Paper text:
Results: We describe crystal structures of four unique bispecific VHHs that engage and activate the cytokine receptor pairs IL-18Rα/IL-18Rβ and IL-2Rβ/IL-2Rγ. These bispecific VHH molecules, referred to as surrogate cytokine agonists (SCAs), create unique cytokine signals that can be tuned by linker engineering. All four SCAs crystallized in a dimeric conformation where the two linked VHHs interact to form unique antiparallel VHH–VHH interfaces with their complementary determining regions (CDRs) pointing in opposing directions in all structures. Interestingly, comparison of the four structures by overlaying the N-terminal VHH shows that, while the C-terminal VHHs of each SCA cluster on the same face of the N-terminal VHH, they adopt four different inter-VHH interactions.
To enforce the dimerized conformation across the VHH–VHH interface, seven pairs of cysteine mutations (S1 to S7) were designed using the Rosetta protein design program to determine structurally compatible disulfide bond positions in the DR3097 SCA. LCMS analysis showed that all stapled SCAs except for S2 formed a disulfide bond with no detectable traces of the reduced form, suggesting that the dimeric conformation could be sampled in solution and might not be just a feature of crystal packing. The highest thermostability improvement over DR3097 (Tm = 61 °C) was a 16 °C shift measured for S4 (Tm = 77 °C), followed by 13 °C, 12 °C, 7 °C, 6 °C, and 3 °C shifts measured for S6, S7, S1, S5, and S3, respectively. Yet, in the case of the IL-18 SCA DR3097, the dimeric interaction has enough temporal stability in solution to ensure stoichiometric formation of the engineered disulfide bonds, as we have shown for the six DR3097 engineered disulfide pairs.
Residue numbers in the entry: 1 to 51, 55 to 101, 107 to 118, 130 to 227, 231 to 242
The structure:
Amino acid sequence: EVQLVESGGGLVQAGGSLRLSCAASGSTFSLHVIGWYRQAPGEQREMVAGFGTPYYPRSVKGRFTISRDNAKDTVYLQMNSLKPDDTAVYYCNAARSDWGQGTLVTVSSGQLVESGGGLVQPGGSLRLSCAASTSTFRLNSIGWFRQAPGKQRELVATITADDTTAYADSVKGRFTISRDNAVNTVNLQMNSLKPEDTATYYCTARVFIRGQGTLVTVSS
């Protein structure tokens, strides 16, 4: 088989920009010039970029831009002027000629510290919670990152100043998120963990700031 890996998932405020990345490896020649795809929970799979000359949907035309690098097996997507319809898990390409883990991207519609962590089997019913300077109106766009030592940042869940929730395909159905309106903290369920999930977890992403980071392991 051929392997695809997406990376670059961010939670951003509207009008912001991103670069998605997709690194490939497989059994055939070093360059295959092909595209990008996405999915939001209220939507099916959708083409984002690709093909013999490049193509973009009307919904992203002029905003998203594909590019490629040949020395390092990476294909990219500049994404300018992000919008709350662009909150989606972005996927790279058909496996051969009809498949990656999926990278969550979220766009928000409107002294850091975390708690929880530990060691688990066979997984579920945890109380990770993120908690800093709770009282004074600090309630901002938020989500939980995770990182294992080799591979890069992966966004798994998101919340914001409103109770609206979205997840990564890596965790969909298994993770779950909520926020307390009096304690002003956000919680992560972490149901039915799998060894692939062992990572240190972080709570924040962008400027007005990093988390403490807390390790979850599941060894059994």
